[PDB]
Symmetry: D2
Subunit: 242 residues, 4 copies
């Protein structure tokens, strides 16, 4: 069974303006918070600059002048499914995110799905080769699992027994095995992720993820992600540059 | 000298949106619900297989009891804090898993700045008088230097170049103001480290107040901290 | 078909030179001396009133007991680690206060890659065989995919990207047990936290083995800094390290 | 009234020990050699098959050109910094990828504490005198509070924490210009970012002066890693660094 990439926005900043600060703005949530924090530095509550009088104008300005630390106050979480283990091994090299990921030590993978590398998505021959090799690996897994539980059948704690079995058995599961992950980042962390991974230099699977994250973040905070331009390459893949 | 009292205002928390095609719901909203979701994502335990942990409060109690603290990182809270001293912020910002935006003495004029009275001096008219007179002397000097530095030196940077030099004389007690954002794990660590007998009483008072507001927001996440009063009437928090 | 044994090689540590004007000397050099120097800098406490903290090992043991762990961050150690699996590195790199440089399957040839045997099946020749046969089939599949993918991306002019486009796709079939190699750098505090989390009975046996070996090499380069960790051998013969301060 | 000039002393750097059975060597030691080792581990490029990057300095210049800054994190330098003000350290420690150990006003008596002169008033004696007079006045208030606080905490039988309870309140009156002292440790990537942000005309002139001195000593340790930073003197005589 193959798994399609799915990205679902599950959390974002709720902003509660403090009543005794003489300031308002034409926005809500993370974008509003980011403006509040910017202004706290200068106590510029009355907005004496006409061209930064709207939220979008203030956020646009912040980025233009490169005051990126102000962006860190607002965050967004996604639940990402239909991503491979090779892709999460790349993703989690980003150290200014927080992660909760599906565990092969704890979750049975006998019926696990696989993710097709975008490079061979339209190639039926290559896909068939991939999927049959995946079925062979899953069969080896179930075979290893039985023998391993038998082998640890002097381990009185049955729960620990199965986990000892499962963590060794998963040695044969391929990189393409689907995983699922909650990723939380602040806006600065997201911008850095998109710059790095939505590039022609990046692997195509993570590039595809970065583009989809960008599209969804652009909706929550248009002015924070505006400078990114999405273009298509010769192969129909997209990159985002700023 | 006008004195500034500590004020802590909660200005941001988490909005949670359960994703439609995952067969799970919970009784909670916001940060605590997000934390449960992220913990269950690890085990894909979307049904309520275990009764003891089939409510949000039961689930988070488990998470904390068995030390799975990384899952707490997904939810955040922001405060706007005023009536805190410059020496207090110099300690606060040593915590590197928070994000900060702070009142800038290079930009903001301090001719009328307030001072924060150290908790140890608060109850004493003599001591407070000594501080406030010293503060007034320093503000006079600040303004003197500011005038001679503007004269010593474009118009905006002239002022800023002047202002960044002039603040050399502003005391540690000078009021500052700051936005602090942290995830639940970061806040837990801050409270454990700062709401303690080992900490300065100013940052201690700050940490207790943050704990009080956080526990109102997310009581299962902060339930293991007990507030105790010491002989000197200050408060500490232990887990 | 070829198996890779765990190997941990210490490749970098801290070199310390005391500032000559500071009226202080100590019992040690490198990292442990740096850490003492940093701790004394907070207090400007250059003199030595207490027999128990008047030696480097003594001062360091004191820092750890009173929980001033931020002082330990000034000294770092790097290892080059080989004979570690991809599933092991996927756990390892969740530690975010380390720096990593790791063998890239997007670039490096994997047709002859070695496999890492899970410790749980190390002594069972039949299980080793089920595993290595599977890895051989997977490497054959990788080579079959790559041949075709190379043709598909041949018209990409940049040599480095066209090799990555083919190989990044081919490695989809490589198993978790595939050998990787990684340079890991961290400061003493970061190493302490890793050991606490990974040299434990809750941890997977492969990363546990790695943690214990790092601990042993770290305790050798940095006396007193890791002394509160005590290695014990569980009943299955695997080793765990425990500390009452971590 | 004693003034303290900036001093930056390099106290630690990376010691590199190349691993026996990896078929590679290079024309450097220390942090620069380690950085090259880590970079080559990513591709197992041990034979050095590219002649243009076959020297250490060339490989390091390549890393930076290609933007693979993560590899620079493996090597570090530590400084002991004195003659820096409290306002300067309040800025410096906003950099969260450094480690710090700093002189504590909670624990260290400040009766004899020195003043750091802002670079802005350095060539104006009358301004310096206003500063140092205000410092002396603050320091006398500090001592006055300290005695009066040590008395007021007679309750406390523990003499150590009695004097710290005193000191932590008493330092309320100490000025921003109060000298502090700090050990700062960072890897090469963190140092590059610090220099980029602080050795610029946008930064306060004290921290800018600090960043320039660090850059000069770091360039001595790892020239190729810091070569793209070029010091310029602005019209006012201060120095900026730009890449
Ligand atoms: C037995 C075991 C089982 C595990 N099971 C799972 C699992 O099922 N699913 C899963 O996704 N992961 C799992 N993990 C991974 C685990 O949740 C951590 O990600 C990993 O162990 C890294 O350690 P750390 O979280 O302490 O953070 P590190 O990255 O090692 O950080 C060190 C310290 O810095 C602090 N810190 C770092 N970053 C932040 C931050 N952003 N905010 C606040 N504080 C921070 C914390 O104090 C932390 O202890 C498991 C780990 C173990 C040991
Ligand atoms: C009572 C008290 C006295 C103090 N006295 C002094 C003093 O005399 N001098 C002085 O300089 N400071 C002093 N400090 C500051 C102290 O050293 C810490 O910098 C500060 O409290 C931040 O807490 P933390 O060290 O846990 O790091 P945080 O920045 O709060 O990080 C949280 C967690 O992330 C992890 N982490 C973060 N960065 C790293 C890293 N670079 N490497 C490895 N792990 C990391 C650690 O697990 C850490 O616990 C004092 C603090 C207290 C509470
Ligand atoms: C001219 C100037 C004026 C300033 N004015 C103000 C002011 O008025 N008010 C104020 O509060 N501050 C001010 N600052 C401080 C500034 O906003 C930063 O806090 C400080 O310079 C630290 O640098 P940094 O933001 O690059 O982060 P560092 O902590 O130096 O981290 C380095 C890099 O790590 C990454 N990073 C670290 N932490 C995170 C995180 N939590 N999330 C995502 N990425 C992270 C970023 O990529 C960053 O570039 C000013 C700084 C300068 C240079
Ligand atoms: C095209 C491509 C190819 C790659 N190839 C390889 C490879 O062959 N081998 C390999 O091992 N990795 C490889 N990587 C991973 C890469 O080295 C980084 O680990 C990963 O992209 C995370 O990004 P980041 O390093 O910018 O830092 P993040 O962890 O995303 O941190 C964000 C920012 O915080 C700051 N920061 C975080 N931690 C530190 C720190 N410890 N010191 C100083 N600053 C810090 C930096 O400013 C950084 O930009 C590759 C990545 C890409 C995009
Ligand atoms: O003991 C564990 N350690 C670990 O780091 N994780 C991880 C890292 C990975 O990102 C994810 C799933 O890992 P695994 O397949 O090893 O369970 O959570 C999981 C565990 F169970
Ligand atoms: O309790 C303390 N908390 C703290 O954060 N520091 C830090 C912050 C600052 O970077 C330096 C000196 O702090 P202080 O003058 O408050 O002691 O060490 C020191 C303490 F003693
Ligand atoms: O584009 C890349 N992105 C990435 O994060 N790495 C990392 C992640 C992993 O820790 C290791 C090897 O990754 P991979 O097999 O995907 O090349 O280096 C490597 C790349 F080439
Ligand atoms: O150039 C600056 N650099 C800096 O780090 N800050 C910080 C540090 C401090 O936490 C707060 C105010 O610093 P200052 O009073 O120097 O403006 O924001 C502010 C600037 F203007």
């Amino acid at each position: 069974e193959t798994a399609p990439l799915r990205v679902q926005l599950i959390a974002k900043t709720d902003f509660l303006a403090p009543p005794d600060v003489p300031w308002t703005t034409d926005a809500d949530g993370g974008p509003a918070l980011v403006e509040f924090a910017g202004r706290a530095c200068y106590q510029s509550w009355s907005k004496p600059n006409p061209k930064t009088a709207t939220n979008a104008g203030y956020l646009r300005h912040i980025i233009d002048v490169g005051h990126f630390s102000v962006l860190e106050h607002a965050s967004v979480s996604f639940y990402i499914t239909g991503i491979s283990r090779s892709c999460t091994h790349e993703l989690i090299r980003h150290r200014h995110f927080s992660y909760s990921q599906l565990s092969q030590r704890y979750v049975p993978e006998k019926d696990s799905r696989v993710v097709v590398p975008p490079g061979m998505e339209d190639d039926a021959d290559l896909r068939h080769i991939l999927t049959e090799a995946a079925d062979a690996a899953r069969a080896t897994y179930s075979e290893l699992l039985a023998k391993l539980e038998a082998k640890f059948a002097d381990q009185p704690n049955a729960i620990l027994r199965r986990k000892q079995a499962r963590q060794a058995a998963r040695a044969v599961l391929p990189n393409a095995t689907e995983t699922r992950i909650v990723v939380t980042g602040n806006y600065r962390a997201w911008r850095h992720f998109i710059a790095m991974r939505a590039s022609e230099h990046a692997d195509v699977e993570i590039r595809r993820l970065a583009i989809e994250c960008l599209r969804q973040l652009a909706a929550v905070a248009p002015a924070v992600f505006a400078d990114f331009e999405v273009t298509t390459l010769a192969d129909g893949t997209e990159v985002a540059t700023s």
